[PDB]
Design a protein around this ligand. Structure first.
Ligand code: 22U
Ligand code: NA
Ligand code: NA
Lengths: 11, 250, 28
């Protein structure tokens, strides 16, 4: 339900 | 938030969203108290009855938000956690006594029109303002009803309730580290926190210096916006000695 | 912080949000 956040923050 | 309204832009620039990395979902509210410290409820991070035990790397904080679900490019800032600190006498077994936790950010956050810290109360501000009938303000992205979810941050203003009325509303044991807020059945107006508002701030605007202070943390309630029930909030000033100890030493 | 609790888009501009007066009126 949430817009995907930038990959940068999931590193 | 039940029976609140949409927040204005920049109305609660200390509001923080606790966000799970995988699956990507909202976990809780929280608040910004400096460029590197975020305050929340302990039960947002640790609650064994529900098999909840989050570690730093499980979590992100999202600061400066308005929309619940959108990625607010050029506005919100997303920060990783360095360390979690839960109150050593947090009572998850019984009544959520001392429901408070701090999170230190890996890097300090830049302030902006949308990102700004709230004050923590001194003894005199707390004594002056924590009085039955005086109203504070709760903000969050939690459910709109007990039994759905909002598009943007919600806001509700609620009166502090006399401690005997809080006690007489529940079988759960209340402590001095809690206060309760909400309207009485006869008072007409409604409103409450709900699931997902956990850990967000109960704030008051001092009439002495026109600054916003965080008096409470969204902690517990039986249902949401039920007649004769009230929301319970962690008493921030009562636990400020622990807050200062963590920040001074970490 | 030294300017804690002062919102950029409200107190810092001397603008009032739509319901803060409800809080003030309760502080009796
Ligand atoms: N419904 C339980 C009641 C409870 C209180 C103390 C100890 C055990 C259970 C609750 O509120 N819980 C169970 C653990 C988390 C918390 C919650 O949902 N908090 C969110 C909430 C909901 C409505 C109003 C408020 Cl202020 C806060
Ligand atoms: Na009781
Ligand atoms: Na109620």
């Amino acid at each position: 339900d949430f817009e995907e956040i930038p990959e940068e923050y999931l590193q | 938030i039940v029976e609140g309204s949409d927040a204005e832009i920049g109305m609660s620039p200390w509001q923080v969203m606790l966000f799970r990395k995988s699956p990507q979902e909202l976990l809780c509210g929280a608040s910004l108290i400096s460029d590197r410290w975020v305050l929340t409820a302990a039960h947002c991070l640790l609650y064994p009855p529900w098999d909840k035990n989050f570690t730093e790397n499980d979590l992100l904080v999202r600061i400066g938000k308005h929309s619940r679900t959108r990625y607010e490019r050029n506005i919100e800032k997303i920060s990783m956690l360095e360390k979690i600190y839960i109150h050593p006498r947090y009572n998850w077994r019984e009544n959520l006594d001392r429901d408070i936790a701090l999170m230190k950010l890996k890097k300090p956050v830049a302030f902006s029109d949308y990102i700004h810290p709230v004050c923590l109360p001194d003894r005199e501000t707390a004594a002056s303002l924590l009085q039955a009938g005086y109203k504070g303000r709760v903000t969050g992205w939690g459910n709109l009803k007990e039994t759905g979810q909002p598009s943007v941050l919600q806001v509700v203003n609620l009166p502090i309730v006399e401690r005997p009325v809080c006690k007489d509303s529940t079988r759960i044991r209340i402590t001095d580290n809690m206060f309760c807020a909400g309207y009485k059945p006869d008072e007409g107006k409604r409103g409450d926190s709900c699931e997902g508002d956990s850990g967000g701030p109960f704030v008051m605007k001092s009439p002495f210096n026109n600054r916003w202070y965080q008096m409470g943390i969204v902690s517990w309630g039986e249902g949401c916006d039920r007649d004769g029930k009230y929301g319970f909030y962690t008493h921030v000033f009562r636990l400020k000695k622990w807050i200062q100890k963590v920040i001074d030493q970490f | 912080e030294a300017d804690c609790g002062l919102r950029p888009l409200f107190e810092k501009k001397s603008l009032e949000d739509k319901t803060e007066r409800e809080l003030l009126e309760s502080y009796i």
